[PDB]
Design a protein around this ligand. Structure first.
Ligand SMILES: COc1ccc([C@@H](O)c2cc(-c3ncnc4cc(N5CCOCC5)ccc34)c(F)cc2Cl)nn1
Lengths: 456, 1272
């Protein structure tokens, strides 16, 4: 059907469509022929390098969705093992799967069958609107496979497609109905939306990055959908005061915030997972305090005996002090040093009233030293020469941190510490008598780094 | 004829157009006309010749079926004979054999009985020219079903000889072209590669005169001539080869002319051998002006030139480079390159070993071309470094010994010798390295020839290399060493007297000026010469160890040698002088570990002689020094010498420990489960460091002994027991720390049905507390273990998780487990276990086996790896003989959400555990069953096929067992690596047959099952076991064989052949499937006899439904066990039943299911002892000694029937009708060769012949277990 040529494509596309039509009919219903066709079209939607086959297989699945509801009457839509209910269950099992090419298949299935199931109702409040969480977990499982495999792209696109219709459906149809229980939710008769955002709140600090993001944006689009139509600024203070202080701090701390065996770079993925959890806490705080949702001093400070500040201090004290896993560890530690810089930026530039909780441990030669070391020779802290987003984006987060730092008091260690590395004598002595010659590497690279730092 | 098929199909499908049957063939709703299926069919049926062939064939067949209505029988026969004459005209008249045309006529001639007697000679010649042999093979084998049927055999054998398949080729030069007795002898001499006496008694039996028992057929005279040609080709005496090529064609004076060109049989039979012998002789250096003139005069016309130019195309290149017209030799080598291209592209892909043979010539032809190109450079004759790196690459590139027959080595070495002689004469140091290159290359060829048992060619190569092997000291020691190791290797298949005679004479050639002044300079060469000296004396000594007198009875002047290096003190003299030579080798790659093995195996075999001078101390050092390198053979000697130190505990442990400490310890995983066994007993320190180092690099290997052996070992207050127990507990704490491996083990433990575990507990209590109420505190110490899973539903929840089986079982069995806790906790009687029986049957009725889904264990159902807490690493990696990489090993990543409870009594169930390799891996899990037997016999199969891959005879036949990874994670829980796309034999047998006959086989009193039961009951007296012993005194051979044939006649004969011809769609598919099945099953059967694998029901056999190869499974019986313990003995080495036989015919059962057995048995009784002592460690952990003795006997040469007698006498002392047992085991003395053969000293061939004539013996298959199904 989806062949390269026009003659054999425009032939055999109507073939497969017409067979989808006929095999979806009460005469061809409950037949091993039809289940064979469905199996074939699935293991075409979930396979390696034939992608032009995945596209057309998604089209075939949306045709299935059309004609299966178009044929099977509601008087018999209770014992069918091939109806849309079981189709969506098999899509879920295809999505919660360790294979980096079956989750992609369920992603494409949703992407093609969202144009339906959203123009249909009276049975759609239990299949998928409830199962946004399951495809969220699909984006969680996509944490490891490959950025360029297109699994995260399609998964984000379908969480997109699903939020853009759940937000509309459940703003008026928001009542204690017997909606089907999705995975991980507490067993209850009603799961309308309050526990949907309560689940989104259970982890905005899950270590897997893109699922965490999507959850955070799902709050920031869903919170103005309760009948109160309120906004997070007062809601987080309300829940923190009516549910205890420990709630909002702990549900962002993670699960494992509590050694020197990895003080030297090591790839033991226990360390990589602690780094991931630190990144999760960093991002969730940054995105909550940073906008007016909560105050910097509201959730930070010693009154609640927090844990972020301790581990971030330990970090900058012990970040920059097998052969190929070193680069992996370096990447995963640089992606979190950059995020703590962004955290300091969103901590200072948001309210210059809480810097007192930023104890002098980072205002010592721990924050500012990694600052200086990114500015000059960023490869010293493991920034691998050869990446794209990180290297081009570094002189942005570094400078924005400097500009958040200048206004605040801790511009003094700033000046007296930059001045120990970009003192004038360094620039003058770098510009020696001969800078044009065979000794390119050392002289030219040193000047390039110092000039780039000075331009920052 | 290219287009004849499309033409004919067009012509036939024209006349369908102007017929009124075009009424929309279905005219209903899902339509289409009745012509849009015919016109495009023919449109494509003239674009490709395969649809053309196949439409012509199906339409021919349809016409000849629909002519059965009209065309009365006489008219039928007239028409069919017209077709047959036309088809003979097709084959005889065709000019360029178009493979789809030839195959079309040649397989539509196969589907009709009248047309099946086509033309053996034309069939064969057209298959050979068309390179489509399997269609002809099917035709000839269906014509040879239902002299004409001796020239059919000649053509069949002619047509296999091009598809390799040499075993089934030799299987009819001994069963159809036969009936004399020198034929078998010479073919046997050819099979085991002794092509000296084989050709010798081809000549002397071709030169014979009278033989007053019958004149030899011409069909075997021409055979003998061809066989002598091929034999003389193997051991390449090209003198005799050209003489035999000219012998039977014309007179003794060589006239060579168009004599060969007439009567094409002369062409086919003599032209290859003729020019091979002549040109080879021209190549080694001679002129003889013999074949050159014939070739040159043949360079005219069409018939005399086209055949030789198109089908030799490389001998032409060599001859013309000899004539030094480089352009034409080039043209011919390139023409040979496209010749290989077109030939190889035309062998079917399923014709394995035809493409190997065609590919093996590419190396040689490329050598030819690259030399002619290298010599074309004018400056190449002035610069010497081009020669330097050409020699470097040519000594880097060799054919491989053990997988290239000696003709490829011959080709490469001779052609390279000619090339490099041309180079040397084209450039007058260089010539010193030239001579070195020739010498080393010929020595490499000798080594190859020697290590694949082509002894005589190696001897002749030493002889022709001896004249020039005197110029240098190293060349002297090289020649003497090569000849001496030749003698050692070739002195093994011989008789003991022959062995001692032939290895004694390589002693004077060893004490001459080769040990004079050269045992001082090259210490490694000195060590190799010492090894050869020591092994010479070893062979002589260990030879005369057989008998004290008759060995030193037939002897002569040589006896003074025996005297100088009574009659029982010479034993020790040879021993000790060999020991001195061997030790001086030892103090002086693998030469260090070659000395280590020679020393250690001398000591160990002399020990095993003595058990019926500290060798027990001596072996360990060299063993562990070699295990400090890589060695399967040195892997072994922990437990044997640890036992001989359990006898003598004072000496040589700390040296063992010191050497074991310093090694890369990745080499104990293959034996981990044997060394962790001894830690429960004394002297356990022998394996402490290396296990504690494995557990720090490859950390999972302790949980299996030390949750079972720990309570199976009683560690007292001994000064060393406490530290050993704290060592094992400390590794346990340092290995079992994550609670993840134990979590997987508990998930699988709960995956077992609660009913089976309760039944096991009931068996334990009924066998433990019922014998005598003296075993105290056992029930108290074991009840909590089963209560931790059974009883209250919350116990497994505390243990692993909330369990669905305990949810539907612990709740249902509440007031019974309450009673069990109240009374059975301290009852300690087991007097009245009817409560256990009723509880078990209640579990059978309302605790259904169909759990029906994996959700029953949520941890497995919701594994979903989320964090590193010691990820599982699915069990089955870590083979051994590699540096384990647990990062390339597949890690568990999820589970497939379905479980199928495959139906057995104990009922294991099979699970589809996922993996991160994006592939998938299914498994079986057995709960309550110990799997040390299966895992450990599979260890044995791995060592066996490691042996096999290293025997060249077995290797070229690609002889390997099929093994699956068995890994027990504890006693009462193992998993088994279930292979992909397989099926059991039972399902093929009952799925190929028809519904009527499956019904007749299942439900009918006359069926072999019902017939056998009624036979036993009606002429025995009773209905159950023990009737066989009552039978056997009134169950004479004749009546039993007649009844066996009666019952067998019911079940179809061609049934498994129907299976293979049913899933093939090609002749090549059928041919490859049947050959693969027969070969694999032959090695399955003989490897299962080397260590008695009983209980070979039809359901213990798996077979790929993608290759046809066979897999052995479910090794419950591992030694002679069904023949010694079971109430119904199994008096048969292996299943070779009726269907396996009737798979191959017209081929007889002694052509392919014989030669594979022979090569396998040869590879097995050519051992260091690997099988024997790995079996020693098989059985000697908690009469096993007589089991090992029987294995030694029936591996070192023995009669299968006396061995089965030994088994049965060990297991059936004073048993009823034991005389009849032994009489049916031993044979008849007039109908079974088994009986008519001696006790031992049987050769491989004779051993296996007796073995098969015991396996296919109707006197045992008539009386054996009813479920084994001896009729099918
Ligand atoms: C539809 O298939 C089949 C096949 C066999 C049977 C019964 O003989 C059968 C076989 C066992 C059994 N035992 C040990 N190892 C095995 C190893 C197996 N492997 C490993 C290699 O790859 C192929 C499968 C299979 C089965 C094994 C068993 F515990 C129960 C039964 Cl009832 N029933 N049905």
């Amino acid at each position: 059907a989806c062949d390269v040529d026009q003659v054999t494509r425009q032939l055999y596309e109507p073939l497969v469509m017409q067979l989808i039509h006929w095999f979806t009919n009460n005469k061809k219903f409950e037949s091993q022929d039809t289940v064979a066709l469905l199996e074939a079209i699935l293991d075409g939607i979930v396979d390696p390098v034939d992608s032009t086959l995945r596209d057309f297989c998604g089209r075939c699945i949306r045709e299935f969705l059309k004609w299966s509801i178009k044929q099977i009457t509601p008087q018999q839509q209770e014992k069918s093992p091939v109806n849309t209910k079981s189709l969506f269950k098999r899509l879920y099992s295809l999505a919660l799967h360790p294979n980096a090419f079956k989750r992609l298949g369920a992603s494409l299935a949703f992407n093609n069958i969202y144009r339906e199931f959203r123009e249909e109702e009276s049975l759609v409040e239990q299949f998928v609107f409830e199962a946004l969480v399951i495809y969220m977990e699909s984006l969680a499982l996509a944490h490891a496979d490959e950025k360029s495999l297109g699994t995260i792209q399609q998964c984000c696109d379908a969480i997109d497609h699903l939020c853009r219709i759940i937000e509309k459906k459940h703003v008026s149809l928001n009542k204690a109905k017997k909606r089907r229980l999705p995975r991980g939710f507490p067993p209850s008769a009603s799961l309308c939306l309050l526990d949907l955002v309560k689940w989104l709140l259970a982890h905005c600090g899950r270590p897997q990055t893109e699922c965490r993001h999507k959850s955070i944006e799902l709050f920031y689009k869903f919170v103005p959908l309760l009948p109160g139509n309120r906004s997070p600024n007062l809601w987080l203070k309300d829940v923190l005061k009516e549910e205890g202080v420990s709630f909002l701090i702990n549900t962002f701390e993670g699960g494992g915030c509590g050694l020197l065996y990895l003080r030297g770079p090591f790839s033991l993925q226990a360390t990589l997972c602690w780094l991931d959890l630190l990144l999760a806490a960093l991002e969730c705080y940054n995105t909550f305090i940073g906008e007016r949702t909560v105050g910097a001093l509201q959730v930070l400070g010693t009154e609640a005996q927090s844990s972020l500040l301790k581990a971030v201090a330990f970090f900058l004290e012990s970040i920059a002090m097998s052969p190929q896993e070193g680069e992996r560890y370096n990447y995963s530690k640089c992606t979190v040093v950059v995020r703590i810089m962004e955290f300091t930026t969103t901590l200072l530039n948001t309210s210059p009233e809480g810097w007192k909780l930023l104890k002098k441990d980072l205002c010592n030669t721990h924050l500012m030293r990694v600052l200086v070391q990114t500015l000059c020779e960023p490869a010293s802290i493991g920034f691998n020469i050869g990446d794209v987003q990180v290297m081009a984006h570094l002189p942005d987060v570094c400078v924005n941190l400097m500009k958040a730092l200048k206004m605040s008091p801790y511009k003094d260690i700033l000046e007296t510490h930059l001045r120990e590395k970009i003192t004038a004598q360094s620039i003058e002595e770098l510009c020696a008598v001969n800078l044009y010659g065979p000794d390119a590497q050392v002289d030219r690279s040193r000047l390039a780094a110092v000039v780039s730092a000075c331009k920052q | 004829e290219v287009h004849f098929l499309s033409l004919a199909t067009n012509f036939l499908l024209e006349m369908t157009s102007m017929s009124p049957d075009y009424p929309n063939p279905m005219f209903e709703h899902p339509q289409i006309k009745h012509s849009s299926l015919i016109t495009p069919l023919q449109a494509v049926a003239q674009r490709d010749p395969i649809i053309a062939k196949q439409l012509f064939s199906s339409l021919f067949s349809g016409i000849l079926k629909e002519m059965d209505k009209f065309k009365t029988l006489s008219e039928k026969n007239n028409i069919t004979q017209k077709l047959l004459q036309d088809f003979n005209r097709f084959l005889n008249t065709t000019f360029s054999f178009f493979p789809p045309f030839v195959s079309c006529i040649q397989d539509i001639s196969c589907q009709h009985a009248a047309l099946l007697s086509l033309d053996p000679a034309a069939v064969s010649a057209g298959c050979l020219a068309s390179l489509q042999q399997p269609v002809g093979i099917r035709l000839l084998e269906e014509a040879l079903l239902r002299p004409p049927d001796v020239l059919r055999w000649v053509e069949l054998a002619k047509l296999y000889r091009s598809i390799g398949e040499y075993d089934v080729l030799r299987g009819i030069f001994t069963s159809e072209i036969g009936t004399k007795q020198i034929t078998q002898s010479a073919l046997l001499a050819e099979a085991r590669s002794d092509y000296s006496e084989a050709a010798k008694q081809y000549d002397e039996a071709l030169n014979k005169q009278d033989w007053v028992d019958g004149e030899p057929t011409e069909a075997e005279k021409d055979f003998w001539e061809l066989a002598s040609l091929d034999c003389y080709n193997h051991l390449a005496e090209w003198k005799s080869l050209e003489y035999c090529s000219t012998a039977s064609i014309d007179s003794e004076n060589p006239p060579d002319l168009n004599k060969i060109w007439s009567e094409p049989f002369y062409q086919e039979t003599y032209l290859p051998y003729m020019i091979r012998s002549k040109l080879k002789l021209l190549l080694q250096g001679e002129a003889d002006q013999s074949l050159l003139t014939f070739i040159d005069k043949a360079m005219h016309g069409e018939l005399q030139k086209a055949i030789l130019e198109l089908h030799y195309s490389q001998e032409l290149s060599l001859l013309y480079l000899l004539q030094d017209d480089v352009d034409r030799a080039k043209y011919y080598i390139q023409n040979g390159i496209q010749s290989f291209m077109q030939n190889y592209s035309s062998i079917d892909v399923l014709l394995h070993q035809s493409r190997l043979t065609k590919l093996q010539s590419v190396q040689a032809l490329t050598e030819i071309q690259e030399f002619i190109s290298f010599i074309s450079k004018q400056g190449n004759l002035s610069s010497q470094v081009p020669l330097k790196r050409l020699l470097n690459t040519w000594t880097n590139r060799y054919p491989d010994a053990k997988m290239d027959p000696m003709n490829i080595w011959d080709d490469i070495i001779t052609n390279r010798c000619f090339f490099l002689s041309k180079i040397e004469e084209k450039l007058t140091d260089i010539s010193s390295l030239i001579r070195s290159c020739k010498f080393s290359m010929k020595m490499k060829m000798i080594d190859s020839a020697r290590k694949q048992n082509n002894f005589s060619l190696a001897m002749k190569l030493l002889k022709e290399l001896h004249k020039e092997s005197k110029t240098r000291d190293d060349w002297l020691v090289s020649w003497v060493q090569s000849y001496c190791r030749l003698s050692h290797c070739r002195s093994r298949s011989q008789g003991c007297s022959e062995q001692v005679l032939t290895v004694l004479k390589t002693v004077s050639l060893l004490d001459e000026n080769n040990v004079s002044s050269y045992l001082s300079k090259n210490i490694l060469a000195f060590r190799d010469q010492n090894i050869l000296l020591g092994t010479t004396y070893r062979i002589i000594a260990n030879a005369l160890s057989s008998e004290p007198a008759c060995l030193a009875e037939i002897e002569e002047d040589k006896a003074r040698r025996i005297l100088e290096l009574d009659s029982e003190k010479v034993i020790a003299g040879l021993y000790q002088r060999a020991f001195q030579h061997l030790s001086e080798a030892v103090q002086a790659a693998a030469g260090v570990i070659d000395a280590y093995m020679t020393l250690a195996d001398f000591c160990d075999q002399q020990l095993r002689k003595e058990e019926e001078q500290a060798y027990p101390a001596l072996v360990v050092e060299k063993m562990l020094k070699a295990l400090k390198l890589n060695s399967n053979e040195a892997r072994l000697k922990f437990p044997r010498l640890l036992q001989i130190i359990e006898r003598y505990p004072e000496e040589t442990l700390s040296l063992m420990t010191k050497e074991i400490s310093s090694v890369p310890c990745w080499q104990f995983i293959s034996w981990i489960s044997h060394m962790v066994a001894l830690l429960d007993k004394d002297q356990a320190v022998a394996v402490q460091h290396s296990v504690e180092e494995i557990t720090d690099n490859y950390p999972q290997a302790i949980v299996y002994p030390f949750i079972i052996s720990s309570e199976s070992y009683s560690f007292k207050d001994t000064s060393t027991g406490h530290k050993n127990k704290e060592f094992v507990a400390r590794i346990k704490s340092k290995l079992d720390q994550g609670g993840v491996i134990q979590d997987f083990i508990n998930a699988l433990d709960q995956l077992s049905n609660p009913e089976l575990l309760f039944k096991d507990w009931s068996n334990d209590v009924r066998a433990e507390l019922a014998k005598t109420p003296v075993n105290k505190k056992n029930i108290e110490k074991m009840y909590e273990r089963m209560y931790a899973a059974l009883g209250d539903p919350k116990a497994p929840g505390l243990g692993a998780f909330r369990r669905k089986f305990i949810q539907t079982f612990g709740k249902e069995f509440d007031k019974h487990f309450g009673k069990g806790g109240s009374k059975l906790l301290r009852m300690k009687l087991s007097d009245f276990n009817d409560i256990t029986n009723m509880l078990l049957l209640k579990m059978n009725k309302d605790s259904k086996p169909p759990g029906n889904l994996k959700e029953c264990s949520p941890w497995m159902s919701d594994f979903k790896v989320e964090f590193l807490r010691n990820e599982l690493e699915i069990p089955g990696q870590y083979d051994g003989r590699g540096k384990p990489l647990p990062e390339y090993h597949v890690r568990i990543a999820g589970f497939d959400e379905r479980v199928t409870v495959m139906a057995s009594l104990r009922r294991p169930k099979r699970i589809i555990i996922r993996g991160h390799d994006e592939r998938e891996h299914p498994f079986l899990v057995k709960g309550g069953e110990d799997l040390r037997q299966d895992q450990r016999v599979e260890q044995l199969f791995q060592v066996m096929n490691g042996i096999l891959a290293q025997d060249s005879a077995c290797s070229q036949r690609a002889l390997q067992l099929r093994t699956y990874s068995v890994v027990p994670m504890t006693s009462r829980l193992g998993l088994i690596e279930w292979l992909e796309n397989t099926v059991t034999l039972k399902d093929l047998l009952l799925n190929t047959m028809s519904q009527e006959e499956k019904a007749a086989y299942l439900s009918d009193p006359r069926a072999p099952p019902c017939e056998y039961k009624d036979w036993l009951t009606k002429m025995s007296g009773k209905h159950d076991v023990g009737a066989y012993m009552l039978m056997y005194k009134g169950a004479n051979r004749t009546e039993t064989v007649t009844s066996f044939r009666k019952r067998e006649s019911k079940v179809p004969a061609d049934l498994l052949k129907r299976a293979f011809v049913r899933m093939s769609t090609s002749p090549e598919a059928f041919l490859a499937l049947r050959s693969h099945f027969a070969s694999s099953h032959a090695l399955i059967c003989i490897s299962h006899w080397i260590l008695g694998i009983g209980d070979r029901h039809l359901n213990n056999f798996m077979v790929a439904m993608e290759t046809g190869g066979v897999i052995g499974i479910d090794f419950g019986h591992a030694f002679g066990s069904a023949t010694q313990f079971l109430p119904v003995p199994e008096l048969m080495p292996f299943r070779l039943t009726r269907q396996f036989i009737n798979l191959m015919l017209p081929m007889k059962e002694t052509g392919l299911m014989y030669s594979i057995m022979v090569h396998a048995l040869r590879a097995f009784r050519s051992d260091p002892g690997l099988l024997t002592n790995t079996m020693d460690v098989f059985v000697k952990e908690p009469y096993p000694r007589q089991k090992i003795c029987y294995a030694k006997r029936k591996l070192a040469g023995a009669n299968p029937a006396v061995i089965t007698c030994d088994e049965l006498l060990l297991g059936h002392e004073k048993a009823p009708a034991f005389r009849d047992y032994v009489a049916v085991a031993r044979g008849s003395k007039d109908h079974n060769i088994r009986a008519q053969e001696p006790e031992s000293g049987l050769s491989e061939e004779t051993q296996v012949k007796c073995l098969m004539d015991q396996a296919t013996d109707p006197n045992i298959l008539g009386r054996t277990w009813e479920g084994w199904e001896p009729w099918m």
